[PDB]
Amino acid sequence: YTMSLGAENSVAYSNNSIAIPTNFTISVTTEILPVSMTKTSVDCTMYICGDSTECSNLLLQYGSFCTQLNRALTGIAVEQDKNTQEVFAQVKQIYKTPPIKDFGGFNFSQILPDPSKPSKRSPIEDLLFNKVQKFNGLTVLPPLLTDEMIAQYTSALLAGTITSGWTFGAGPALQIPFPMQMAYRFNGIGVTQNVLYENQKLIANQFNSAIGKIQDSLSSTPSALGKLQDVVNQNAQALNTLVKQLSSNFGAISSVLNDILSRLDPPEAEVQIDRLITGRLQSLQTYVTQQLIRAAEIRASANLAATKMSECVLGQSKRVDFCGKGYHLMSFPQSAPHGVVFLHVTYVPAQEKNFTTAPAICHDGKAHFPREGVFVSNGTHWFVTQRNFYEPQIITTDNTFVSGNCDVVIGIVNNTVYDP
Ligand X SMILES: *[C@@H]1O[C@H](CO)[C@@H](O[C@@H]2O[C@H](CO)[C@@H](O)[C@H](O)[C@H]2NC(C)=O)[C@H](O)[C@H]1NC(C)=O
Q: What angle do CA 358, 363, 364 make, to 5 degrees?
A: 160
Least separation, in Å, of the C-beta of 218 and ligand X?
14
Q: Which stretch binds its own copies (CB under 8 A): 57-65, 123-131, 205-213, 336-344?
A: 57-65
CB atoms within 10 A of CB 12: 7
Considering only residues 198 through 257, tell me which ones interact with its own copies, judged by CB under 8 A.
198, 200, 241, 244-245, 247-251
Least separation, in Å, of the C-beta of 420 and ligand NAG?
18
Least separation, in Å, of the C-beta of 108 and other proteins?
12
Rounded Cα distance between 347 and 326, Å, is: 6
Cβ closest to ligand X, residue 29 vs residue 400:
29
Instruction: Give the residue, chosen from 19, 173, 232, 348, that forms a contact with ligand NAG under the rule CB under 6 A.
Output: 19
Cβ closest to ligand X, residue 107 vs residue 187:
107
Length of the chain measured in residues: 420
Cβ closest to ligand NAG, residue 21 vs residue 324:
21
Binding to its own copies by residue 136, rule CB under 8 A? Answer: no
Binding to ligand NAG by residue 5, rule CB under 6 A? Answer: no
Amino acid at 148: E
Rounded Cα distance between 238 and 264, Å, is: 33
Nearest to 268 by CA among 283, 282, 252, 256: 252
The bridge status of strand 374-377 relative to strand 339-358 is: antiparallel
Amino acid at 102: D
> What is the Cα 202 distance to its own chain's centre?
27
Q: Which partner, its own copies, ligand NAG, other proteins, none, binds residue 115 by CB below 5 to 8 Å per kind?
A: none
- φ, ψ for residue 89, nearest 5 deg: -90, 60
Residues that bind ligand X (CB under 6 A): 23, 25, 107, 109-110, 202, 205-206, 351
Q: Which stretch binds its own copies (CB under 8 A): 24-32, 39-47, 208-216, 319-327?
A: 319-327
Nearest to 104 by CA among 182, 157, 217, 187: 182
Instruction: Give the residue, chosen from 68, 130, 262, 378, that forms a contact with ligand NAG under the rule CB under 6 A.
Output: 378
Instruction: Give the residue, chosen from 116, 265, 380, 407, that forms a contact with ligand NAG under the rule CB under 6 A.
Output: 380
Binding to its own copies by residue 360, rule CB under 8 A? Answer: yes
Name the CA radius of gyration of the chain, rounded. Answer: 31
CB atoms within 10 A of CB 250: 16
Cβ closest to ligand X, residue 217 vs residue 351:
351
Binding to its own copies by residue 315, rule CB under 8 A? Answer: yes
CB atoms within 10 A of CB 72: 17
Rounded Cα distance between 158 and 111, Å, is: 8
Longest distance between any two alpha carbons in the chain, whole Å: 111
Amino acid at 11: V
Cβ closest to ligand X, residue 102 vs residue 419:
102
Binding to ligand NAG by residue 164, rule CB under 6 A? Answer: no
Instruction: Give the residue, chosen from 148, 216, 268, 297, that forms a contact with its own copies under the rule CB under 8 A.
Output: 297
Least separation, in Å, of the C-beta of 21 and ligand NAG?
9
Element holding 159 (H helix, E strand)? helix 147-164
**Footprint on this chain of ligand NAG (rule: CB under 6 A):** 12, 15-16, 19, 352-354, 362, 378-381, 410-411, 413-414
